[PDB]
Amino acid sequence: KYEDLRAYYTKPSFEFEKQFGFMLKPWTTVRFMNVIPNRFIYKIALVGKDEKKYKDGPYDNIDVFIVLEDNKYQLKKYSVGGITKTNSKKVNHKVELSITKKDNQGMISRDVSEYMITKEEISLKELDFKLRKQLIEKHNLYGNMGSGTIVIKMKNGGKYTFELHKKLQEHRMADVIDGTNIDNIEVNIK
Ligand SMILES: [Cl-]
Ligand SMILES: [Cl-]
Ligand SMILES: [Cl-]
Structure with a gap:
């Protein structure tokens, strides 16, 4: 059940601090913030109050808590929410x-x-x-x-x-x- x-x-989670968040051409109706702590681009969906909170950026000094969602029908791996000020x-x-x-x-x-x-x-x-x-x-x-x-x-x-x-x-x-x-x-x- x-x-x-x-x-x-x-699922494993990933956490990074003091990141530089940036926005790209959107690839769905939901907007995303991107961070690259290392060489992998994490894409974080902007939902709820985040849709109002972040516009075009960039946004420095953010912390992110990341869990990669299962979505069989999207090749891009993404996480949702979990963005805070450092x-x-x-x-x-x-x-x-x-x-x-x-x-x-x-x-x-x-x-x-x-x-x-x-x-x-x-x-x-x-x-x-x-x-x-x-x-x-x-x-x-x-x-x-x-x-x-x-x-x-x-x-x-x-x-x-x-x-x-x-x-x-x-x-x-x-x-x-x-x-x-x-x-x-x-x-x-x-
Ligand atoms: Cl416990
Ligand atoms: Cl709240
Ligand atoms: Cl309180």
């Missing part, structure tokens, strides 16, 4: 990650760890992806259980919720938040 999710959220100063903002899990036998277990935030501005894409990957690896998410929530709890009381039974909505992969205003992170698997 959860094979597609497990496959997607165990740090102005170094950040080490340690937050509590609590994990409550009710397994297929209804047994409730509770665990805790700490999650190091290193970015002033961080995409929901990166938090969603890295957290689900950690959950798959350490708590067998998408093994027997594949529903519930990840909740990023902010210092003003606000919440960003990722529902585990489906992929993060595409537009939300462009949403960015203040990494240092993250109060804690709560996972509830069922």
